[PDB]
Amino acid sequence: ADKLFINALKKKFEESPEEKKTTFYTLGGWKQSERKTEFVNAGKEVAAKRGIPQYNPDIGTPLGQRVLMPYQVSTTDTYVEGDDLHFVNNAAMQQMWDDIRRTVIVGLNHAHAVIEKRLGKEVTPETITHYLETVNHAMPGAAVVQEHMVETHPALVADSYVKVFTGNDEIADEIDPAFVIDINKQFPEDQAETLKAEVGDGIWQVVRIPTIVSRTCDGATTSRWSAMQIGMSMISAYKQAAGEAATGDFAYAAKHAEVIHMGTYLPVRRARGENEPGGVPFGYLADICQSSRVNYEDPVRVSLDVVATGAMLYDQIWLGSYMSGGVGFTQYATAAYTDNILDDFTYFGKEYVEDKYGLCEAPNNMDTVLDVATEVTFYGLEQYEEYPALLEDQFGGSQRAAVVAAAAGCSTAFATGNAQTGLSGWYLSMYLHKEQHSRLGFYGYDLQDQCGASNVFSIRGDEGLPLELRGPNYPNYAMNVGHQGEYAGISQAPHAARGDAFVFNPLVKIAFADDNLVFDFTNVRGEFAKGALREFEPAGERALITPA
Amino acid sequence: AKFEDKVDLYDDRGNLVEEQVPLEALSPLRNPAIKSIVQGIKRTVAVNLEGIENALKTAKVGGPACKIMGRELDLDIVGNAESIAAAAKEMIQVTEDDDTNVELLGGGKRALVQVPSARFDVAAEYSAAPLVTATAFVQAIINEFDVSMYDANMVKAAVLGRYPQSVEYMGANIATMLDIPQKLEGPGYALRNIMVNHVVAATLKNTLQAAALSTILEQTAMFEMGDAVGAFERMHLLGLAYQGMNADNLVFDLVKANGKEGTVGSVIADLVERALEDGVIKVEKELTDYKVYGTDDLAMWNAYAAAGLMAATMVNQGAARAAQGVSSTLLYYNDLIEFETGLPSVDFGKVEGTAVGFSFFSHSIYGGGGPGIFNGNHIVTRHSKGFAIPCVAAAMALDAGTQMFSPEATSGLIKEVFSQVDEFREPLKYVVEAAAEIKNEI
Amino acid sequence: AKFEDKVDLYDDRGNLVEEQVPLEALSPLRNPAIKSIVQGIKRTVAVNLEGIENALKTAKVGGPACKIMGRELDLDIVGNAESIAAAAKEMIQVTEDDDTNVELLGGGKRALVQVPSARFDVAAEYSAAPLVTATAFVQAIINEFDVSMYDANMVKAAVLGRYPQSVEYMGANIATMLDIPQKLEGPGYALRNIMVNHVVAATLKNTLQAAALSTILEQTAMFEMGDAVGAFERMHLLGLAYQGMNADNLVFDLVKANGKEGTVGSVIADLVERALEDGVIKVEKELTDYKVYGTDDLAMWNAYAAAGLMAATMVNQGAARAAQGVSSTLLYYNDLIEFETGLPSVDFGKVEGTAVGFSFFSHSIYGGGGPGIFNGNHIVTRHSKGFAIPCVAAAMALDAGTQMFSPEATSGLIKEVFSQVDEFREPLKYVVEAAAEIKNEI
Amino acid sequence: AQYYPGTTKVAQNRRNFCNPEYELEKLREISDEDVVKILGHRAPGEEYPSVHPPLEEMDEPEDAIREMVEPIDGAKAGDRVRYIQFTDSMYFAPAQPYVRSRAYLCRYRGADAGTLSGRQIIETRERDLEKISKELLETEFFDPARSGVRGKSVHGHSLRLDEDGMMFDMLRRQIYNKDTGRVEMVKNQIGDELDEPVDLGEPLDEETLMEKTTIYRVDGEAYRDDVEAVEIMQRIHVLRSQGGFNLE
């Protein structure tokens, strides 16, 4: 069967993919491009309206001396210019982040204990349902106790709500199903049983605050907003005095003792509060992505959906905007979710492993790392050598390094069933690549790469951590493109091969199994394509409160 | 001595120990027992060996509800605790027979660790205690069971948690009374970021000892912050003495006189009477059926008023055996005494202000919690410069079981380890003995 | 005693001082001069009296370009510096014959302040130095000129800046080599958050002394972080000795042999020869016209390689008299030596990795800057556990004026004050002397 | 010194570039003035600008390290630090990015070398840079079709060659002339037009490129077949991994 990237290469270029020569400088620069043409015209209009020059194709160097390529969004039949995958231009990408940023998980276990002990009242599915009706009025920003309150417009905050889940089926079934994330409905049988056993009789809220608020404010707003309206709803639904000593236990429980943030806060040089991208560990990112519960018979698909999720969030939005900005890092990320390239390399590796070892049956050791990561690295590099069109497509060494090493690392973890040896395979891939082509990435690409082998199995204070627990604030990882989303993939890989329901936090996994989200986390790449086509409908807009 | 003042020192039963001790014998800068307490708090760590073992066995590492399927390791840590602790001790110590302590508790389920003082002498701060302890136990466990290169990172996660992806040791199975330096509200705040429940736990709910430990920590922080330098030093020392060390038996005697039937108001009346009797205040002038009091020694008035504030908390929250009303006592003792006298309240309004926000943030939806989760570094309760939090410690010591977030709930690991240390558990004893010992060198 | 290794120690002219010194005599945990340096850096503050005066006269307080019209105060601070400094000293000291130092410099424009060590003995961390110094000078200025209650808050703003609205002392007219505890990348990092330019400034650009001070600070931090505990301790001690203290004159002799015409590559060749001559490495296997080297002592190979890395920086950046290429040296010394030998590079790749990102962040749009603004706490340069930053200090000492953000630009106040202190300025001298003194107590 | 393991022509060429005793083959003659023009930092006849005074005019204190390390001539003079940057085609250019940085820090004093996939740079004192640059331009470090002198807009290392065998250049600094079969440099490295172009000689033919290249490819010598070179890379991975864990 053809290599999975061949269709995309034939779409991009007139030459066959194997052809070594082409002709440049005859395409009219930017004029070859529908999108650049749109931008030139828009810049003229913007500048004329506001009285300050803006986009101008004649500033600096002339884009488009070569072909300005379309990209296939991998697993789709959608081909778009890369500008349509810039997070600024792609409402699906923006909404993916808003849906994470505006979510927190908040237990009801301490809260219900406070109710039964301290207030001496009973909790049943019926009282929980009444509480949930109440908090779904209050959470978007509406009142339940005071006179003369002024409130948020319901239609501006239609995306905000609260659901619950529990591992106890009989309890779940007694709560009004409008409010319940039904684990048995959303997960295949074996995964559902794993997840229900993790949760047990615990009861957890999934709280989503309004996108318009999240965009006005920041991620650290989420758990506070959540807690205020949980607090008001506990007062109203359980008939408390409206501000007594017990009220503070609900606040402490909802804000601290049983809250799970999506991201933890960051140190001062990169100061941020909770629920910002740098605080989201790789294992959580894999669990937020919902490919695992749909595509479970295909561990490559699951792993590469996680890579797409993470490459976009971590490289485009986080490193490319929060930590830098400007034109940013679209194609550093698109390399990992376009043209079915990473897919080709990773299916090669999975098949190699299946045949030699069987998934998850290789020894978890350095022999396996050396074997698998080397073989897969050489396959990927050979494709760039065999197909000049492929090399011209993934033109930046960093892009190639990330893609080849992601395939090598995922494949290694498919073999061992362990993310840490997967990680070792990622670094070996870099080292081999660097020697093969006498180049790797950009100036600063392999800071973590060169520290990498030694820090995989270290146990020291700021060095040692299982990969699932690492994230964008792991010291070596804190700066550079072309790694973080790929690491989320490697984190997913052994778990997908094992058939595990989750990678690092079962509550996070369940919390995104929800079709009331705006973004469809089951099909991240499909959503990116929809956004690229300007077909995605985000929350948070102000149309209702602005002129027609 | 810089100051002329002398105080009489009493024990936690209200009995005289030593008369006419120079005030500065109680100073954090001079008193060797306060130095030993502070250095002990810097260097002490509680290790939960049971917790480490269970995290490993279940692969539940890295924070609440987290788990890595397939990473489980079944290691008999508690059954080999003696060997593991000895091996850890060899790495933690600097020299044989130095002041390193590693003691097993609970049948090997817990260890008390005191990292040698010499490591802190050449350290900037206090994080060597958890970091040296953590790596010594990670290495000792790896070495005990010959844990492989491939698996050892799970031991690290079980001991210290999600650090360094998280800033904190998120999910760790070690504990300290101090918290990380990044969480300080301001430079110099570290001895303030010690939960009230931890203080109550360490002192086994002995009311006067909890008040003393809290006051020692708070007023020692006031020196580190520079607040107790120059013009303010005597105020802070007198506050330590009279509010936290029961100087002149004033707190004890006010409680004795008001405990049977008294209220916050009756304690105020007694304190004003005592201040007048001792010449601390005097009538400055007469309005219509109202005496305006003045003072020639504001720091001493403040200290007397602070003793009365402590006594008022003990009487009000001791009568209720319920801590919540400490926020009210801290407010209205101060509000009432100003309109009773025409003199400023404790800390010139800052206890009252702290109490307003503390009341709000312990009876509302917005933040805070019960009294025991506050501390001098908490945004709600940082504002008074040592004169509020010790009363909260006294109140929580007197709580008979009204709190969900009790010391039993928040501070059990801390209790088991830190209450073993005599100077932490009974600081009033040791600080008074040390003051008496150095009285003729001040 | 714990380790058998002995080293020969030299002065910064390459002359023998003491042979056969036990390795642990250089340990931060044992060497009294390292203790003195570390405690000195915790306790020392530079006060810019001229700066305070000018900020007040113009009401330019609270940070860059800030000013409050109408708040100007014209006080003759520098003209009354002796009185002000003496008054501040009275508040800063604990007792009159303690180790408090307050010394005027520059005709009273600056003061060197060393806050007494006893304040740190009963402190959690190091912020007492700026905070006690700041309030003592604020109070002394107020008292000198009888500044009113209404105006005194301007003196406070001129001394300490926008704190506490800002977390840092934003706009302050005092300086320390340390920075605030909240800025630590991790617990244990405070001795790493010391700008390279500050180290170069304090050591008056003496290359070996700058390398020594940086290495002392970095490797002492590795102890506070727990990195030099247990399995790693000897590696860190050998690194301190050979890379930062010129043990066995190895750095010195490599520079001597390569200084006239050499390159990074020629230093590598000499170091590999020397390692082979000394039995640190040996040929393990013959490939086709290629010898694969091995070692039975990875920590010693690492130390030899680290000495070569320092020498390579001195030769490469010394030849250019331009510091920027230190990022390149740190990368390619390590890259080249691995393919030259088949052995791992310094810090098992972590210097090389540090160098990759440091190169990027000193030659790109995204962050960083010139070599002198980095430090062991910088996100770009934290990754190697002490083996990279001292080379950056050496390179900046050797820079003849190619940098915009030079020590003259960033570190003038630090230079004037901290270079006065003999142990800060010439640490190699004092640490070697202390090691020789305690050699028979190890 | 050994420099690099392996038994391929690639490996030998990598060793040769690093070895300062290996005489780089000179392929073309370039005048001093034309090297200055290509660099584009100053005009011919313009005095070297300075960044600081001559070292002689400074009053530096005793420092044993300074005393032992001879400054390069441009450091003595106080010259600015300037650069030359090259891009090398993955279609068998003789030099390649890490080959260059490794070689530069073996051969040249006082050097700040940087490696990237699409560009490789050296920064050093200006008069010394000019001497080094002559060697980089005249010798087998350089082919005028498959390598480019580029201080910006570097794209091309990974692109298909054009019909003349020339690497892509967004700014077209090097022009192949069919009538001589020779390449001319028509702009300096930052892209400003030269008054008079510089002859860079003929592109190397396919056979000679294959003799001289330092890139491994399946259609040349594959890295996976240089088993001794791979062995050393894998060894370094394993030894680093073990060392980070427990110093064994």
Ligand code: F43
């Ligand atoms: C439950 C609390 C305790 C607490 O922690 N917060 C509450 C409630 C909270 C809720 C009320 C929303 C709702 O009704 O569902 C909100 C809007 C915060 C939120 N969660 O969004 C709020 N208060 Ni409150 N709260 C207010 C106020 C006040 C005034 C109202 C006094 C009166 O006579 O009506 C009093 C405090 C006081 O007595 O001074 C007050 C109390 C209280 N405040 C009592 C409920 C009082 C009651 O049972 O009626 N708020 C105000 O004084 C005005 C501004 C007003 C806020 C809304 C706005 O700014 O538009 C609101 C601010």
Ligand code: F43
């Ligand atoms: C000025 C720098 C130095 C720096 O600090 N950043 C730059 C430029 C910056 C700009 C370029 C935007 C513009 O043109 O105005 C942006 C987009 C960041 C921003 N400010 O928005 C960027 N790089 Ni760069 N940069 C990239 C890359 C690269 C590759 C390109 C090699 C090639 O052969 O084309 C090389 C590094 C290398 O050689 O490995 C590179 C260099 C460089 N990168 C060189 C300029 C190179 C040149 O003169 O042509 N980037 C890539 O390798 C791919 C992704 C791409 C980024 C944009 C995206 O992700 O869509 C972009 C990311």
Ligand SMILES: C[C@@H](OP(=O)(O)O)[C@H](NC(=O)CCCCCCS)C(=O)O
């Ligand atoms: C106290 C503190 O809360 P915690 O006790 O830390 O939960 C803090 N909140 C606040 O200060 C709430 C301020 C806004 C609502 C009350 C307005 S009067 C915060 O969330 O950081």
Ligand SMILES: C[C@@H](OP(=O)(O)O)[C@H](NC(=O)CCCCCCS)C(=O)O
């Ligand atoms: C290094 C550091 O910058 P500073 O040196 O502190 O200016 C840091 N930037 C970054 O890490 C930039 C990361 C994103 C751009 C480069 C991607 S390879 C930051 O802004 O906090």
Ligand SMILES: O=S(=O)(O)CCS
């Ligand atoms: O050229 S650099 O590697 O510095 C930046 C690449 S985006």
Ligand SMILES: [Cl-]
């Ligand atoms: Cl499937």
Ligand SMILES: [K+]
């Ligand atoms: K926002």
Ligand SMILES: [Mg+2]
């Ligand atoms: Mg085609």
Ligand SMILES: [Mg+2]
């Ligand atoms: Mg115009």
Ligand SMILES: [Mg+2]
């Ligand atoms: Mg029913």
Ligand SMILES: [Mg+2]
């Ligand atoms: Mg529904």
Ligand SMILES: [Mg+2]
């Ligand atoms: Mg849908």
Ligand SMILES: [Mg+2]
């Ligand atoms: Mg009596």
Ligand SMILES: [Mg+2]
């Ligand atoms: Mg009475």
Ligand SMILES: [Mg+2]
């Ligand atoms: Mg006055």
Ligand SMILES: [Mg+2]
């Ligand atoms: Mg031979």
